[PDB]
Amino acid sequence: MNAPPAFESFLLFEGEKKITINKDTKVPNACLFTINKEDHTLGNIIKSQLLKDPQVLFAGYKVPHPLEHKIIIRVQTTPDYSPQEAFTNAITDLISELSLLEERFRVAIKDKQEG
Amino acid sequence: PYANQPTVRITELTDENVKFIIENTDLAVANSIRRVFIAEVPIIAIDWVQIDANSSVLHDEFIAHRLGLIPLTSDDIVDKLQYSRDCTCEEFCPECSVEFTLDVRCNEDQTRHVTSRDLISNSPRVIPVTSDDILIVKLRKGQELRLRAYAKKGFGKEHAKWNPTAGVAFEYDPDNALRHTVYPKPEEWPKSEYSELDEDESQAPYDPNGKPERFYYNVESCGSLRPETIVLSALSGLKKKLSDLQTQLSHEIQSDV
Amino acid sequence: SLKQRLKGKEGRVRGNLMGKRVDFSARTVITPDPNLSIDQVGVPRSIAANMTFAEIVTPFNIDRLQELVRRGNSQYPGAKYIIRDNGDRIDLRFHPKPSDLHLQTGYKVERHMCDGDIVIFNRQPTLHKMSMMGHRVRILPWSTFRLNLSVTTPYNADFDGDEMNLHLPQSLETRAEIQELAMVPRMIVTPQSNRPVMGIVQDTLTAVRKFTKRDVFLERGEVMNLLMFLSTWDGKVPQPAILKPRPLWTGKQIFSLIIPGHINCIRTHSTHPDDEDSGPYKHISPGDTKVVVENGELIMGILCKKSLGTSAGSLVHISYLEMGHDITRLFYSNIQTVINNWLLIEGHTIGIGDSIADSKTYQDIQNTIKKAKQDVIEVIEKAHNNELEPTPGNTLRQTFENQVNRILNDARDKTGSSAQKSLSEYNNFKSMVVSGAKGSKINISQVIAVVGQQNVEGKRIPFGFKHRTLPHFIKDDYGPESRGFVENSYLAGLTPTEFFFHAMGGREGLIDTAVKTAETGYIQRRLI
Amino acid sequence: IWGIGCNP
Amino acid sequence: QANQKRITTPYMTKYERARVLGTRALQIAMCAPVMVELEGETDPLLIAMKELKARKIPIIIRRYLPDGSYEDWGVDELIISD
Amino acid sequence: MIIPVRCFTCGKIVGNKWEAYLGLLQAEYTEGDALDALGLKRYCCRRMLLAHVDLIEKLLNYAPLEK
Amino acid sequence: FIGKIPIMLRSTYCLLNGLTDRDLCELNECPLDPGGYFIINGSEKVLIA
Amino acid sequence: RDGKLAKPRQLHNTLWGMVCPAETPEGHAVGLVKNLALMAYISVGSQPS
Amino acid sequence: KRHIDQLKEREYNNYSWQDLVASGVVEYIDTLEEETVMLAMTPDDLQEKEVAYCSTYTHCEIHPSMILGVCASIIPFPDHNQSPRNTYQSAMGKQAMGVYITNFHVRMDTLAHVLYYPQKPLVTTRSMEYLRFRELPAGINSIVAIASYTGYNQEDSVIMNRSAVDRGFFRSVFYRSYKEQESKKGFDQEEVFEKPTRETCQGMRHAIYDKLDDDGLIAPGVRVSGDDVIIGKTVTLPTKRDCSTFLRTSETGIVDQVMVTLNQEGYKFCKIRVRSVRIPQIGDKFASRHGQKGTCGIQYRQEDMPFTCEGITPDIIINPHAIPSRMTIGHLIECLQGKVSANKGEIGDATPFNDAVNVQKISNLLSDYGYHLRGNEVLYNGFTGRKITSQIFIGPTYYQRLKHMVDDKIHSRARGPIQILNRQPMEG
Amino acid sequence: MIYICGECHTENEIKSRDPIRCRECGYRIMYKKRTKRLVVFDAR
RNA sequence: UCAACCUCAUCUG
Ligand SMILES: CO[C@@H]1[C@H](O)[C@H](n2cnc3c(=O)nc(N)[nH]c32)O[C@H]1COP(=O)(O)OP(=O)(O)OP(=O)(O)O
Ligand SMILES: [Mg+2]
Ligand SMILES: [Zn+2]
Ligand SMILES: [Zn+2]
Ligand SMILES: [Zn+2]
């Protein structure tokens, strides 16, 4: 009777922002990105790619509550770098990696067949 | 500061299985690709059932559950079909759904096995993976099952009926060299199929500078989507999720400025 | 009769006046929630929709309350009733009442229970005042009350079908009284025994013991992930304990960030050698036992129920007595969160391999049992030949029983010690016993070595049949097997007679519990 | 179920 | 009693703090004038806590001694327990 | 009551395999050999067929309410 | 006629006694039902020894 | 059930093979409600003549 | 051997237990005679010549395991568990959901729970055959991992796989039957089944009376939400009074069967059965066959659950901290034997005192099928993909869904109905 | 309405305030028969 | 804009 509908896991209700950016006052050059209706799938990918960046001092993600559907990513970068830029670059790098993976998987498929 | 270039080598390709290896990739990327295999690959399955007459022993919602779990061929038109929420028309239409019908009566004395074959689709591309058959119910003489169903696009995050895959086998570091798992007695542990160690050596020597790479996948299709296209659709869907995230992030950054 | 109406329990005086059924109360099953804080409780939406709190309409809250009234009883964050100044209760459930939706100062909007409301949480029986505590509401999906696991011990609650009552204060005055006199962070230390009522428990305790070993080294990503779940974090990553060859933090180094303020504590781990304090390596402690927290930093040690548990002088108790109750609440919550995520990494389990011991261990256990049975045979022969002489204050029967019991108990203890020697570091029974999370060395011994003597009414299994225990045994057999000694372990499996005698012992324990409840309840009522 | 000094 | 010959503790007890905070909260929710300048606080209990910290709650506690006499201690006079 | 569609643990379709399982048991095949022939590999899928109790046949003995 | 005695099900005087499982199915009774209870006012009652 | 004496409730040795040792209700009826063992039979009675 | 061979051919040989008694092979012994009889638990171990304990055995037990009852006979490896845990399992097995009878469709019984997909246990006791547990099982075999995953299995709770639940795992049907009898007490005062009318009948409620048919009884197949009018009964008032029955609050079911008969008095009598399909939630109670139960702490999808190399994700995750204090080692032995049975294809034998089934033999059997001797398995964390450092005990164990469900227990009160005498809130 | 007979499974139409006895068999147990309105089941 | 009390038995922590 109190069971949430399944579509709540990924469908934004009206007036809900996918991303909200709030700066972290405790430390300079740090930010906190709150992604709504997202899970570990995107969070772990983004955290790993942010960790690969040398100018990202801190990168972490958390699900504040398993029953609710939200991801919080803290990103702290060096001076002369912006955490928002680090997030954008992480996303673009992951997109490029996934596209390369798609192309090579298609080639591997075509080669496993037809020979 | 940039993404690595992954490489794929497909070892096995059968109508039910894809065994491949992804090298030069992160553990997070590999795990999330597996995760998208399981939960975020769109598929077609029955989600609306209306039972005109059910005199079978199984109650109506039991029949509806079993009908939902029946796989449906979704190779091509699942990409063409729209989600019901996206479709402009009220309720369901040919663009947002596929209609199935079941009209079975056991007039004969012998028990009638209602199968997925008795489900008849309005569009030929979606069929209940019939081309034995999944048994929906057994009908005694004088028992009848009549129903109309609508099948919609969706992914396994909504419901396990929309899982395109049966079992995604994911393994990294077949010989424990990163010591991510610390065996109390290494010798008692069976060797992995992908293990390259000699029989004498239970574990590879600890590699201090190693990082998890060369992930091994075995994706078994449920028959709705071909095992190759499960992987391709999962990669494309993860890329689309990242692109949507980037678009929203750019909009909010512009708003902050 | 009129006397019967007023006389006993269920009478007017006791059943209707001293205690009575009350409104604004909700009962449901409880399930764990590690993510909730100590004071937070998890409330289903239906329960929060039925229960209401009346809020006086003021100039500063008139807009929000009018929005809630507009939503009504149907939309969840709404109002069930509007009480006018005259006392007339406009009903928002039944029909729009468009003219009566207006709010003015002095009206009372009976809004639905929302996040941040203070509610009393109760479990029966309320044996002590920690059984009723004030919790801050958080509304979560599904239909169970969800409470933090550090709060289970005061309530005596386990999530195996238990239910908890919830009482909602209906006035600001009583809300403030509940919040101040009964809030869970204020209830951490009991006046009964001047110890904390709550401590780290279950998975978190075992994972803390594993986390604070010297061996635990955490890489950069794991450190960042764990610092994500530390709410009191200053945002500064500590310099790792090992800078080169690769930057690796330590479990103690990260737990030092959990410990709040500057707290000074000295404890000792459960497996602390008594020789270490007297001899050399007092402050080096080869086993990393002892526990030294200086300036709120864990310099050395492995934490267990003695350091993070409900005992006087614990790190929790010192935190409450030094930093205050709010900071201690944060301390509990942070321990649970970051240690549970590290446990997600390391993992914990129990299997058959824990119950298995070495072949040499099993052989030694068998030899000890053989020697004990032979010694009992010798004592029985001495008694039969009348060589035995009564111990002062005891009959010959009583002294014979005492000697046999001593031999059997000594053999049982020796087998248990052999089984415990067999245990490896990786053994998980030993992990749970050492951490203090669950189990005891007695349980390990019974699992691995010997179940032990089955005794009913403080004596070996009685001669229920005519001069024998079971029909399978010959009459007048006082040996270990006949009178109830179980040499097989649980893993080995009890033989049929041992099974029946073990059932006799378990039955006695169950009867004791069931009989105990009522007598203790009567005593408690009389004292109060 | 253990011994005479323990528990039943 | 008078300012002299006050024998009760100068510190405010936990129960006195609870009842004072609740009473002031109820008054504030009943449109009573607020002594402290609220910094965007719209919760009557939070405003009452803020007033208690600033020692501006306009209440005097009458503590009844067991002999029947009473002592009037102002909230300002009492030392806040927390 | 009737063989479930899809193994609970993984989701491989096991609903089409019960009649073939019974036929292979009638042939001579041991339960394990029949399970292997049907293609069930993981013990999760083998649990579905191995532990299944088919009560639908007992329920079909009772006459229908409407004939 | 002096009275009516409730009959324990599947006892010698029950109608279900001596009936094969097919006949029990024809009467909408379970072949596996043990019996040993009385139907009093439509409710199954079991005498406890 | 009200009686708190722990004598009538305890598993007697003579229950072996005739009453289940494990199966008893828990609460006020521990050891007071019992269940027959699988092979146990109860005498129906006979004429001593 | 003659008697055993004749009994083995029992049917079409007209040899039965009564012939065994008549031959003098077996004998019925009561407690008084049990006091005067030397018994042997087993023939081979005891009757045969050894160091002579007794040489005057007068009887032999047919099998020791028969000392247990009906509910304790389903417990696998009961000799490896602590004694109170077997009592707990007897109590809980009386509460498991399964197909109670095959004629459940015909019976209109209040509070009937029937499980969708019952399964027979992979590890079974022989005496279960005589309890008909195979014919009408109660519970499902489930892949269970004994691990501390996210803290939602702590204390006694249980983490469950949401995908498995979505695939039919432990889904049940709850039938509630309502009875109403129209009756005439006064000569001018009668009760009639009819659809109540707002004007004609003085007593009415907000509850929708539209679903009632012409006869005043809801037809089968109509969804009925809580507080809707199942049966419409009106009493002539010497205009009319509404005595119509309503659904129990939060029932939220679909009508299954509506029967209209005449009772013994000759008055019209109506029974209406409502189906509510209950899917496992995160409050429902599940228990193993070894006396340790627990509510569902949380449900994670298949992507979130830990996975083995083969891709198997546990249906149920139970906290390891349950095992040590309770000492239910039979649970661990049943997991190991179930793994062996599922890979082998046989059904494991867990008779209490077999003496031919050691734990070591089960481990050696499991080794042949490619798994670790002790049943541990390298589990990969579902969220991050990293191998869990401690290898986790996984196996197929039989679990039962107890009738206690959170939906039946959730309750809340706010200025509701009040008693007449005390003028205090009501009870229940 | 129309009530299906318990035993002979033949639909008989019984008016209100009429004894519940099937024509041609006499059985006193009738069943209300499934509704014409149709209810949507989500296959979930 | 809206339904009884007794009694007993069975279960729950
Ligand atoms: C731990 O103490 C509790 C409480 O004291 C409360 N309680 C329970 N029954 C009663 C009763 O009749 N009367 C009163 N007054 N209180 C009662 O229940 C006790 C334990 O009982 P248990 O021993 O069965 O708890 P498992 O050890 O069995 O827990 P598993 O592993 O099943 O989750
Ligand atoms: Mg409990
Ligand atoms: Zn459409
Ligand atoms: Zn499977
Ligand atoms: Zn008829």
What is the number of the ligand closest to the CA of J26?
A: 5
**Residue C176 · residue C118 · CB < 8 Å:** no
3-state secondary structure of A9: helix
Q: Which amino acid is at B11?
A: T
Annotated binding site of J for Zn(2+): 5, 8, 22, 24-25, 27
Q: What residues contact C513, with CB distance under 8 A and at least 6 apart?
A: none
- Give the CA-to-C1' distance from I233 to K7 in angstroms: 28
- What contacts E64, CB < 8 A, 6 or more positions away? E70
DSSP 3-state of I209: coil
Name residues contacting ligand 1 (CB within 6 A).
C 125, 156, 158, 160, 517; H 27; I 156, 292-293, 326
Closest CA to C184 of C323, C320, C304, C31: C320
> Cα I132 from chain centroid?
14
Strands, E assignment, J1-44: 2-5, 11-13, 29-31, 40-41
Query: Which residues contact residue G48 at a Cβ distance below 8 angstroms, ignoring those fewer than 6 apart?
Result: none
Going by the DSSP 8-state scheme, the letter that residue I175 receives in this structure is E
I37 CB contact with strand K at below 7 Å = no
Question: According to CATH, what is the number of the domain B43-160?
Answer: 2.170.120.12
**Residue C231: exposed, middle, or buried by beta-carbon count in 10 A (0-12, 13-18, 19+)?**
exposed
Cα-only R_g, chain B = 23
Chain C's closest residue to E16, CA to CA, is C177
* Dihedral in degrees, nearest 10, Cα atoms I337, I341, I343, I344: 130
Partners of J39 on chain B (C-beta within 8 Å) are 50, 60
Asked if B29 is an interface residue toward chain A (Cβ–Cβ < 8 A), one would say yes
Structural tokens at position E73? 């201690």
Q: Is H28 on the interface with C (CB under 8 A)?
A: yes
Rounded to whole angstroms, how far apart are CA atoms I77 and I124?
9
Buried b (16+ CB within 10 A) or exposed e, I328-344: bbbbbbbbbbbbbbbbb
Residue I129, C-beta contacts closer than 8 angstroms, at least 6 positions apart: none
Kindly report the length of chain G. Answer: 49
Please report how the helices I329-344 and F43-50 are oriented relative to each other, as an axis angle in degrees rounded to 10: 90
> Which residue blocks in chain J are alpha helix, DSSP H?
none
- Is nucleic acid strand K under 7 Å from I409's C-beta? no
Taking the CA of residue B39 as centre, how many other CA atoms within 13 Å lie in the half-sphere pointing to its CB?
Answer: 25
SS3 content of chain B, % helix, strand, coil (to 5): 25, 30, 45
Q: Residue C316 maps to which CATH number?
A: 1.10.274.100
Query: Is I102 within 8 Å of G31 when comparing Cβ atoms?
Result: yes
Which residues of I99-198 form beta strands (DSSP E)? 112-115, 123-124, 140-146, 158-161, 172-181, 191-193
Return phi, psi of residue C80, to 5°.
-85, -35
Q: CA E81 to CA F10: how far, in whole Å?
A: 60
Interface contact B64-J43, CB threshold 8 A = yes
Q: What is the DSSP letter of C187?
A: G
CB contacts, 8 Å: I152 with chain A: 66
Cβ contact I206 with chain K strand, < 7 A = yes
Q: Which residues contact I423 (CB under 8 A, 6 or more apart)?
A: none
In this complex, is the C-beta atom of B184 within 8 Å of any C-beta atom belonging to chain C?
yes
Q: Is G28 exposed, middle or buried (0-12, 13-18, 19+ CB in 10 A)?
A: middle
Question: 3-state SS of chain F?
Answer: CCCCCCCCCCCCCCHHHHHHHHHHHHHCCCHHHHHHHCCCCCHHHHHHHHCECCCHHHHCCCCCCCC
Nearest atom (ligand 1) to Cα of C160: 33
Q: Are F56 and B114 in contact (CB under 8 A)?
A: no
The CB-side HSE value for I241 (13 A sphere, CA atoms) comes to 8
Q: For residue C34, report the phi and psi dihedrals to the nearest 5 degrees.
A: -65, -25
The rounded distance, in Å, linking the Cα atoms of J7 and J25 is: 8
For residues B31 and B23, give the distance between their C-alpha atoms in angstroms, rounded to a whole number.
13
Best residue for ligand 1 mutational test, from I326, I328, I400, I404 (most atoms within 8 Å of Cβ): I326
Nearest chain I residue to A2, by CA: I407
Rg value, chain A, Cα = 18
Alpha helices in A1-115 (DSSP H): 40-52, 83-112
Please give the Cα distance from E58 to E77 (Å, whole number).
Answer: 11
Q: Which domains does chain A have, with CATH numbers?
A: 1-115 (3.30.1360.10)
Q: Which of C53, C56, C58, C60 to mutate: most E Cβ within 10 Å?
A: C60
Q: What is the DSSP letter of C465?
A: B
The boundaries of the domain holding residue F54 are 1-67
Please tell me whether the peptide bond between C245 and the residue prior to it is cis, using omega within 30 degrees of 0.
yes
Distances in Å between the alpha carbon of B233 and those of A106, B38, B215, F54?
Answer: 11, 11, 19, 38
Residues 6+ positions from I307 with CB-CB distance below 8 Å = B168, B170, I313, I379, I380, I382
Helix then strand then coil, % of chain A, to nearest 5: 40, 25, 35
H or E element that contains I49: none
A106 touches B: beta carbon within 8 Å? yes
Q: Mapping DSSP to helix (H, G, I), strand (E, B) and coil, where does residue I393 land?
A: strand
Nearest-angstrom CA–CA distance, J13 and J22: 9
**From the CB of residue I263, how many other CB atoms can be counted at a distance below 10 Å?**
15
Peptide bond into C247 cis (omega under 30): no
For residue I70, the one-letter residue type is: V
Contact (CB, 8 A) for I423 and I297 = no
- E neighbour chains, 3+ CB pairs within 8 Å: C
Place of tokens 């709404």: C78
Give Cα separations from C112 to C25, C69, C80, C99 (angstroms).
13, 10, 7, 22
Gaps after residue numbers in chain A (C–N over 2.5 angstroms): none
Residues of A in contact with C227 (CB under 8 A): 58, 60
Whether CB of H33 is under 7 Å from strand K: the answer is yes
- Local structure of C448: helix, strand or coil: helix
Walk across the sheet containing I240-242 and list its strands: I191-193, I233-236, I240-242
Q: Are the CB atoms for B237 and B41 separated by under 8 Å? A: yes
Listed residue (I165, I109, I101) closest to I137, CA to CA: I101
What is the sign, positive or negative, of the torsion defined by CA atoms of C57, C62, C68, C70?
A: positive
Reduced to 3 states (helix: H, G, I; strand: E, B; else coil), residue C490 is coil
Strands I392-401 and I376-377: antiparallel
Segments in H1-49 forming alpha helices (H): none
Q: Residue I130 in 3-state DSSP?
A: helix
Helix ranges (DSSP H) in I51-188: 83-93, 128-131, 162-166
CA distance D8 to chain C (A): 5
CA–CA dist B37, B19 (Å, integer): 13
Task: Report the distance from CA of residue I110 to the C1' of nucleotide K7 in Å, as an integer.
Answer: 21
> What are φ and ψ of residue C326, in 5° steps?
-65, -45
- Closest to I74 measured CA to CA, from I397, I352, I403, I355: I352
CA dist I340 to C110, F11, F47, I78, I113, Å?
A: 61, 22, 11, 19, 32
Rounded to whole angstroms, the Cα distance separating I94 from I87 reads 11
What's F64's domain CATH number?
1.10.10.60
Residues of G with CB under 8 A from a CB of I: 28-33
Q: Are B153 and B83 in contact (CB under 8 A)?
A: yes
CA A110 vs CA A113, B10, C174, C370, C462: distances in Å = 5, 10, 74, 72, 80
Q: Which residue is nearest to nucleotide K2 (CA to C1')?
A: I205
Provide the 3-class DSSP secondary structure of residue I84.
helix
Domain residue extents for chain B? 1-42+161-257, 43-160
Mutate to test the pocket of ligand 1, among C9, C156, C159, C523 (most ligand atoms within 8 A of CB): C156
Q: What is the largest CA-CA distance in chain J?
A: 44
Total residues found in chain I within this entry: 428
Q: Note the CATH architecture for domain J1-44.
A: Single Sheet (2.20)
Looking at residue C248, the DSSP 8-state letter turns out to be B
CB-CB neighbours of I408 under 10 Å? 16
Are C153 and C210 within 8 A, CB to CB?
no
In chain B, the largest separation of any two C-alpha atoms, in whole Å, equals 77
Please state at what angle helix I359-368 crosses helix I329-344, rounded to 10 degrees. Answer: 30
Contact call for residues C351 and C428 (beta carbons, < 8 A): yes
Interatomic CA distance for residues J22 and I383, integer angstroms: 64
CA gap I24, B133 in Å, rounded:
56
Element spanning I182, H or E = none
Distance from CA of A76 to the nearest CA of I (A): 22
- CA nearest to B1 within chain A: A53
Domain count, chain F: 1
Specify the ligand 1 atom closest to the Cα of I322: 31
Structural tokens at position C144: 């169970």
What is the stated resolution of the deposited model, in angstroms?
2.8
Q: What is the residue range of C277's domain?
A: 202-346
Residue type, C229: F
CA atoms in the 13 A half-sphere facing the CB of I286: 31
Half-sphere exposure of I88 (CA within 13 A, CB side): 18
- The number of the ligand 1 atom at minimal distance from the alpha carbon of C161 is 33
**C1'-nearest nucleotide to the CA of I227:** K2
- Which amino acid makes up residue C237? V
Cα C285 from Cα C291, distance rounded (Å): 10
Query: Among H26, H35, H38, whose Cβ lies nearest the Cβ of I66?
Result: H38
Q: What are the angstrom distances between the C-alpha of A97 and each of B249, C138, C384, I132? A: 19, 41, 88, 59
- Reported as type and span, the H/E element at residue I183 is none
Taking residue A3's Cβ as centre, other Cβ atoms within 10 Å add up to 12
Q: Is the CB of I205 under 7 A from strand K?
A: yes
8 A C-beta contact, residue B252 and residue A19:
yes
- Do C453 and D4 make contact, defined as CB atoms within 8 angstroms? yes
Inspect the structure and tell me whether chains E and C have 3 or more CB pairs less than 8 Å apart.
yes
How is residue I47 annotated by DSSP? I
Q: How far apart are CA C3 and CA C353, in angstroms?
A: 65
DSSP conformation letters of C294-357: ETTEEEEE---HHHHSSSTT-HHHHHHHHH-HHHHHHHHHHHHHHHHHHHHHH--B--HHHH--
Domains of chain E by start residue, with CATH: 1-82 (3.90.940.10)
Q: Are the beta carbons of I289 and I73 closer than 8 angstroms?
A: no
Which tokens go with I219? 């037809």
Structure letter (DSSP) for residue I388 = P
Q: Give how far Cα B88 sits from Cα of A79, B85, B91, B100, C157, Å.
A: 49, 8, 9, 22, 52
What backbone torsions phi and psi does residue J22 show, to the nearest 5 degrees? -70, 135
> Which positions of I are catalytic?
156
CA atoms of A32 and C446, how far apart (whole Å): 53
Could you tell me the fold of the domain covering B1-42+161-257? Gyrase A; domain 2 (3.30.1360)
**Touch between E and F (at least 3 CB pairs under 8 Å):** no
In this structure, what DSSP letter does residue F41 have? Answer: -
| Cβ atoms < 10 Å from Cβ of H40 | 15
How many angstroms separate the alpha carbon of residue I272 from the centre of ligand 5? 20
C-alpha I179, offset from chain centre: 26
J2 touches chain I (CB under 8 A): no
Percent helix, strand and coil across chain I, each to the nearest 5: 20, 25, 50
Do F and H touch, 3+ Cβ pairs within 8 Å? The answer is no
Cα–Cα distance between C355 and C451 in angstroms, integer? Answer: 13
Token pair of I273, please? 């059965």
Structural contact between residues G1 and G30, judged by C-beta atoms closer than 8 angstroms: no
Select from J34, J39, J43 the Cβ nearest to the Cβ of B65: J43
The residue whose C-alpha atom lies closest to atom 12 belonging to ligand 1 is H27
Q: Do D3 and C458 touch (CB under 8 A)?
A: no
I30, I41, I67: which to substitute to probe chain H, counting the most H Cβ within 10 Å? I67
**Strand K lies under 7 A from the Cβ of residue C160:** yes
> The tokens 């509506």 sit on which residue?
I258
Taking a C-beta distance cutoff of 8 angstroms, is the pair I247, I225 a contact?
yes
Which residues lie near ion ligand 2 (Cβ < 5 Å)?
A: C 158, 160, 162
The sign one gets for the Cα dihedral C433, C436, C437, C439 is positive
Q: Please state whether beta strands I229-231 and E60-64 pair in parallel, antiparallel, or not at all (unpaired).
A: unpaired
Residue C124 CB closer than 7 angstroms to strand K?
A: yes
Amino acid at E19: R
B4: exposed, middle or buried (Cβ count in 10 Å: 0-12, 13-18, 19+): middle
Alpha-carbon distance of I314 to I395, in angstroms, equals 8
Smallest Cα–Cα separation from I275: which of C87, B192, B62? B62
Comparing CA positions, the residue from I83, I65, D4, D3 lying closest to residue C511 is I83
β-strand I316-318 against I158-161: which pairing, if any? antiparallel
Distance of CA C234 to the CA centre of its chain: 31
Cα–Cα distance for residue pair G15/F62, rounded to 1 Å: 18
Question: Which chain I residues are closer than 8 Å to J19 by Cβ?
Answer: 262
Q: Establish if I213 touches chain G: CB-CB under 8 angstroms.
A: no
